[PDB]
Short mmCIF file of all heavy atoms in Angstrom, two decimals:
data_model
loop_
_atom_site.label_atom_id
_atom_site.label_comp_id
_atom_site.label_asym_id
_atom_site.label_seq_id
_atom_site.Cartn_x
_atom_site.Cartn_y
_atom_site.Cartn_z
N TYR A 12 -26.34 -30.28 30.92
CA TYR A 12 -26.31 -31.35 29.95
C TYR A 12 -26.81 -32.64 30.57
O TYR A 12 -26.61 -32.87 31.76
CB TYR A 12 -24.89 -31.54 29.42
CG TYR A 12 -24.37 -30.34 28.67
CD1 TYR A 12 -23.71 -29.31 29.33
CD2 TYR A 12 -24.55 -30.23 27.30
CE1 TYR A 12 -23.24 -28.22 28.64
CE2 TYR A 12 -24.09 -29.14 26.60
CZ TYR A 12 -23.43 -28.13 27.28
OH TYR A 12 -22.96 -27.04 26.59
N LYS A 13 -27.44 -33.47 29.76
CA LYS A 13 -28.01 -34.72 30.24
C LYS A 13 -27.31 -35.90 29.58
O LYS A 13 -26.84 -35.81 28.46
CB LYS A 13 -29.51 -34.75 29.95
CG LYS A 13 -30.24 -35.93 30.56
CD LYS A 13 -31.74 -35.86 30.29
CE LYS A 13 -32.49 -36.94 31.05
NZ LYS A 13 -33.96 -36.87 30.79
N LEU A 14 -27.22 -37.00 30.31
CA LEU A 14 -26.61 -38.21 29.81
C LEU A 14 -27.57 -39.37 30.00
O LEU A 14 -28.00 -39.64 31.12
CB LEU A 14 -25.31 -38.49 30.57
CG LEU A 14 -24.20 -39.26 29.83
CD1 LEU A 14 -23.34 -40.01 30.82
CD2 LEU A 14 -24.75 -40.21 28.78
N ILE A 15 -27.91 -40.03 28.91
CA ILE A 15 -28.69 -41.25 28.96
C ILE A 15 -27.80 -42.45 28.70
O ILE A 15 -27.25 -42.60 27.61
CB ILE A 15 -29.84 -41.24 27.94
CG1 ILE A 15 -30.82 -40.11 28.25
CG2 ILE A 15 -30.55 -42.59 27.93
CD1 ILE A 15 -31.97 -40.00 27.27
N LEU A 16 -27.65 -43.30 29.69
CA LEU A 16 -26.81 -44.47 29.57
C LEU A 16 -27.66 -45.69 29.27
O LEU A 16 -28.56 -46.02 30.03
CB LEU A 16 -25.99 -44.71 30.84
CG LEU A 16 -25.12 -43.54 31.31
CD1 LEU A 16 -25.93 -42.59 32.19
CD2 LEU A 16 -23.89 -44.05 32.03
N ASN A 17 -27.37 -46.33 28.15
CA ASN A 17 -28.01 -47.58 27.80
C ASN A 17 -26.98 -48.69 27.76
O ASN A 17 -26.70 -49.27 26.70
CB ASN A 17 -28.73 -47.47 26.44
CG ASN A 17 -30.09 -46.82 26.55
OD1 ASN A 17 -30.75 -46.89 27.58
ND2 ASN A 17 -30.54 -46.21 25.46
N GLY A 18 -26.40 -48.97 28.91
CA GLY A 18 -25.43 -50.03 29.01
C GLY A 18 -26.09 -51.39 29.06
O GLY A 18 -27.31 -51.48 29.20
N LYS A 19 -25.30 -52.44 28.93
CA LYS A 19 -25.82 -53.80 29.01
C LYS A 19 -26.45 -54.05 30.38
O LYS A 19 -27.46 -54.75 30.50
CB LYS A 19 -24.72 -54.82 28.74
CG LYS A 19 -25.21 -56.26 28.73
CD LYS A 19 -24.08 -57.24 28.43
CE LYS A 19 -24.57 -58.67 28.45
NZ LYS A 19 -23.47 -59.64 28.20
N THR A 20 -25.85 -53.47 31.40
CA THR A 20 -26.38 -53.57 32.75
C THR A 20 -26.63 -52.18 33.35
O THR A 20 -27.63 -51.95 34.03
CB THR A 20 -25.42 -54.36 33.67
OG1 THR A 20 -24.09 -53.84 33.56
CG2 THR A 20 -25.42 -55.84 33.32
N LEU A 21 -25.72 -51.25 33.07
CA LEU A 21 -25.80 -49.91 33.63
C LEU A 21 -26.61 -49.00 32.72
O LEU A 21 -26.14 -48.55 31.67
CB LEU A 21 -24.37 -49.36 33.83
CG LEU A 21 -24.19 -48.24 34.87
CD1 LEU A 21 -24.93 -46.97 34.47
CD2 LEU A 21 -24.64 -48.71 36.25
N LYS A 22 -27.84 -48.74 33.12
CA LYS A 22 -28.71 -47.86 32.36
C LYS A 22 -29.28 -46.78 33.28
O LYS A 22 -29.46 -47.01 34.47
CB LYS A 22 -29.85 -48.64 31.70
CG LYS A 22 -30.79 -49.31 32.69
CD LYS A 22 -31.99 -49.92 31.99
CE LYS A 22 -32.94 -50.58 32.98
NZ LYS A 22 -33.44 -49.61 34.00
N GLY A 23 -29.54 -45.61 32.72
CA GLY A 23 -30.10 -44.54 33.51
C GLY A 23 -29.83 -43.18 32.91
O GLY A 23 -29.47 -43.08 31.75
N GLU A 24 -30.00 -42.14 33.71
CA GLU A 24 -29.76 -40.78 33.25
C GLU A 24 -29.10 -39.95 34.35
O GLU A 24 -29.25 -40.24 35.54
CB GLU A 24 -31.07 -40.12 32.80
CG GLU A 24 -32.08 -39.88 33.91
CD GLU A 24 -32.64 -41.16 34.51
OE1 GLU A 24 -33.58 -41.73 33.92
OE2 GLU A 24 -32.14 -41.60 35.57
N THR A 25 -28.36 -38.94 33.94
CA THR A 25 -27.77 -38.00 34.87
C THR A 25 -27.57 -36.66 34.17
O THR A 25 -27.73 -36.57 32.96
CB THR A 25 -26.42 -38.52 35.43
OG1 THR A 25 -25.96 -37.68 36.50
CG2 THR A 25 -25.36 -38.59 34.35
N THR A 26 -27.23 -35.63 34.93
CA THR A 26 -27.01 -34.31 34.35
C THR A 26 -25.80 -33.64 34.97
O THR A 26 -25.42 -33.94 36.10
CB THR A 26 -28.24 -33.40 34.53
OG1 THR A 26 -28.73 -33.48 35.87
CG2 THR A 26 -29.35 -33.77 33.56
N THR A 27 -25.18 -32.74 34.22
CA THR A 27 -24.03 -32.00 34.71
C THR A 27 -24.12 -30.54 34.27
O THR A 27 -24.78 -30.22 33.28
CB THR A 27 -22.70 -32.61 34.20
OG1 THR A 27 -21.60 -32.14 34.99
CG2 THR A 27 -22.45 -32.27 32.74
N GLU A 28 -23.49 -29.67 35.03
CA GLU A 28 -23.46 -28.26 34.69
C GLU A 28 -22.11 -27.93 34.05
O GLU A 28 -21.07 -27.97 34.71
CB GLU A 28 -23.70 -27.40 35.93
CG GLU A 28 -25.06 -27.63 36.58
CD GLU A 28 -25.25 -26.82 37.85
OE1 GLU A 28 -25.72 -25.66 37.75
OE2 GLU A 28 -24.94 -27.33 38.94
N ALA A 29 -22.15 -27.62 32.77
CA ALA A 29 -20.95 -27.36 32.00
C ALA A 29 -21.19 -26.21 31.03
O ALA A 29 -22.32 -25.99 30.58
CB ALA A 29 -20.52 -28.61 31.25
N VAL A 30 -20.13 -25.48 30.72
CA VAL A 30 -20.23 -24.33 29.83
C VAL A 30 -20.28 -24.78 28.36
O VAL A 30 -20.87 -24.10 27.52
CB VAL A 30 -19.03 -23.37 30.03
CG1 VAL A 30 -19.10 -22.19 29.08
CG2 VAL A 30 -18.97 -22.89 31.47
N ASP A 31 -19.68 -25.92 28.08
CA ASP A 31 -19.56 -26.39 26.70
C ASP A 31 -19.81 -27.89 26.61
O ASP A 31 -19.53 -28.65 27.55
CB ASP A 31 -18.18 -26.05 26.15
CG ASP A 31 -17.05 -26.72 26.91
OD1 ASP A 31 -16.70 -26.24 28.01
OD2 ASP A 31 -16.52 -27.73 26.42
N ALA A 32 -20.33 -28.30 25.46
CA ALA A 32 -20.76 -29.68 25.23
C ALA A 32 -19.59 -30.64 25.08
O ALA A 32 -19.73 -31.83 25.32
CB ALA A 32 -21.65 -29.75 24.00
N UNK A 33 -18.44 -30.12 24.68
CA UNK A 33 -16.09 -30.64 25.29
C UNK A 33 -16.17 -31.03 26.76
O UNK A 33 -16.00 -32.21 27.08
CB UNK A 33 -17.31 -31.03 24.53
N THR A 34 -16.44 -30.09 27.66
CA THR A 34 -16.50 -30.37 29.09
C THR A 34 -17.57 -31.41 29.42
O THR A 34 -17.32 -32.34 30.19
CB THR A 34 -16.75 -29.08 29.88
OG1 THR A 34 -15.73 -28.12 29.60
CG2 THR A 34 -16.80 -29.36 31.38
N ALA A 35 -18.76 -31.25 28.85
CA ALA A 35 -19.85 -32.17 29.11
C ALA A 35 -19.52 -33.57 28.59
O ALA A 35 -19.66 -34.55 29.31
CB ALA A 35 -21.14 -31.67 28.49
N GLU A 36 -19.09 -33.63 27.34
CA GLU A 36 -18.75 -34.89 26.70
C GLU A 36 -17.65 -35.60 27.47
O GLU A 36 -17.81 -36.75 27.85
CB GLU A 36 -18.30 -34.68 25.26
CG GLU A 36 -18.03 -35.98 24.53
CD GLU A 36 -17.41 -35.76 23.16
OE1 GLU A 36 -18.09 -35.20 22.28
OE2 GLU A 36 -16.24 -36.16 22.97
N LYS A 37 -16.55 -34.92 27.70
CA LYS A 37 -15.44 -35.50 28.41
C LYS A 37 -15.94 -35.51 30.91
O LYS A 37 -15.56 -36.62 31.32
CB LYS A 37 -15.24 -34.82 29.77
CG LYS A 37 -14.16 -35.25 27.61
CD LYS A 37 -14.28 -35.58 26.13
CE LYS A 37 -13.04 -35.15 25.37
NZ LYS A 37 -13.54 -36.63 23.42
N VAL A 38 -16.97 -34.85 31.41
CA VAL A 38 -17.72 -35.31 32.56
C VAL A 38 -18.39 -36.65 32.29
O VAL A 38 -18.17 -37.62 33.00
CB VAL A 38 -18.81 -34.29 32.96
CG1 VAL A 38 -19.64 -34.79 34.13
CG2 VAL A 38 -18.18 -32.94 33.29
N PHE A 39 -19.21 -36.69 31.24
CA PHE A 39 -20.01 -37.86 30.96
C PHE A 39 -19.16 -39.03 30.50
O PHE A 39 -19.29 -40.13 31.03
CB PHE A 39 -21.08 -37.53 29.93
CG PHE A 39 -22.16 -36.61 30.44
CD1 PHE A 39 -22.81 -35.76 29.57
CD2 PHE A 39 -22.53 -36.62 31.78
CE1 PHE A 39 -23.82 -34.93 30.03
CE2 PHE A 39 -23.53 -35.79 32.24
CZ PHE A 39 -24.18 -34.95 31.36
N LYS A 40 -18.31 -38.81 29.53
CA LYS A 40 -17.45 -39.84 29.04
C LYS A 40 -15.82 -40.33 30.93
O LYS A 40 -15.80 -41.56 31.05
CB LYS A 40 -16.04 -39.68 29.60
CG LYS A 40 -17.34 -39.71 27.51
CD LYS A 40 -16.58 -40.84 26.82
CE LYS A 40 -16.43 -40.57 25.33
NZ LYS A 40 -15.26 -41.26 23.25
N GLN A 41 -15.70 -39.50 31.96
CA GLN A 41 -15.37 -39.96 33.30
C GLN A 41 -16.51 -40.74 33.94
O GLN A 41 -16.28 -41.78 34.56
CB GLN A 41 -14.99 -38.77 34.18
CG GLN A 41 -14.42 -39.17 35.52
CD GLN A 41 -13.17 -40.02 35.39
OE1 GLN A 41 -12.05 -39.51 35.35
NE2 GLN A 41 -13.36 -41.33 35.32
N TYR A 42 -17.73 -40.25 33.79
CA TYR A 42 -18.89 -40.87 34.42
C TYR A 42 -19.11 -42.28 33.89
O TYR A 42 -19.07 -43.25 34.64
CB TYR A 42 -20.14 -40.01 34.18
CG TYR A 42 -21.37 -40.49 34.92
CD1 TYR A 42 -21.56 -40.16 36.25
CD2 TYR A 42 -22.33 -41.26 34.28
CE1 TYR A 42 -22.69 -40.59 36.93
CE2 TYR A 42 -23.46 -41.70 34.96
CZ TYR A 42 -23.63 -41.36 36.28
OH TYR A 42 -24.75 -41.78 36.96
N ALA A 43 -19.33 -42.37 32.59
CA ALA A 43 -19.61 -43.64 31.94
C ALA A 43 -18.42 -44.58 32.04
O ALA A 43 -18.57 -45.73 32.45
CB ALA A 43 -19.98 -43.42 30.49
N UNK A 44 -17.24 -44.08 31.70
CA UNK A 44 -15.12 -44.58 32.86
C UNK A 44 -15.45 -45.21 34.21
O UNK A 44 -15.06 -46.35 34.46
CB UNK A 44 -16.09 -44.97 31.78
N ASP A 45 -16.17 -44.52 35.08
CA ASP A 45 -16.43 -45.00 36.43
C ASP A 45 -17.54 -46.04 36.46
O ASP A 45 -17.51 -46.98 37.26
CB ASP A 45 -16.77 -43.83 37.34
CG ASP A 45 -17.00 -44.24 38.78
OD1 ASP A 45 -16.06 -44.78 39.41
OD2 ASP A 45 -18.11 -44.01 39.30
N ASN A 46 -18.53 -45.88 35.59
CA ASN A 46 -19.66 -46.81 35.54
C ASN A 46 -19.35 -48.02 34.65
O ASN A 46 -20.15 -48.95 34.54
CB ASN A 46 -20.91 -46.09 35.04
CG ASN A 46 -21.57 -45.25 36.12
OD1 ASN A 46 -22.45 -45.72 36.84
ND2 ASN A 46 -21.15 -44.00 36.22
N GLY A 47 -18.18 -47.98 34.02
CA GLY A 47 -17.73 -49.10 33.20
C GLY A 47 -18.56 -49.29 31.95
O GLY A 47 -18.72 -50.41 31.47
N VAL A 48 -19.08 -48.20 31.41
CA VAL A 48 -19.91 -48.27 30.21
C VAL A 48 -19.11 -47.88 28.98
O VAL A 48 -18.48 -46.82 28.94
CB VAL A 48 -21.14 -47.35 30.33
CG1 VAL A 48 -22.01 -47.45 29.09
CG2 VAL A 48 -21.95 -47.69 31.57
N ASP A 49 -19.14 -48.74 27.97
CA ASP A 49 -18.43 -48.50 26.73
C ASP A 49 -19.35 -48.76 25.54
O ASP A 49 -19.45 -49.89 25.05
CB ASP A 49 -17.19 -49.38 26.63
CG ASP A 49 -16.02 -48.86 27.44
OD1 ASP A 49 -15.30 -47.97 26.93
OD2 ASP A 49 -15.80 -49.34 28.57
#
């Protein structure tokens, strides 16, 4: 799964290996938690 972040300052892309788009949504939604993106 891929994540495109369009934050006010934090922008970019990343990917994760997940069985379901639940696990992916909730990796990406810790990732974007740590990157301070809302």
Side-chain angles (χ1 to χ4, degrees):
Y12 296 89
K13 187 177 187 179
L14 209 207
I15 297 179
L16 305 86
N17 279 333
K19 183 179 179 182
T20 50
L21 203 295
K22 63 173 181 58
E24 66 293 278
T25 189
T26 46
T27 197
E28 299 177 88
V30 179
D31 62 282
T34 302
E36 184 188 294
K37 242 23 158 161
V38 178
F39 291 151
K40 242 237 218 167
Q41 189 59 90
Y42 186 82
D45 182 62
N46 282 269
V48 181
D49 281 277

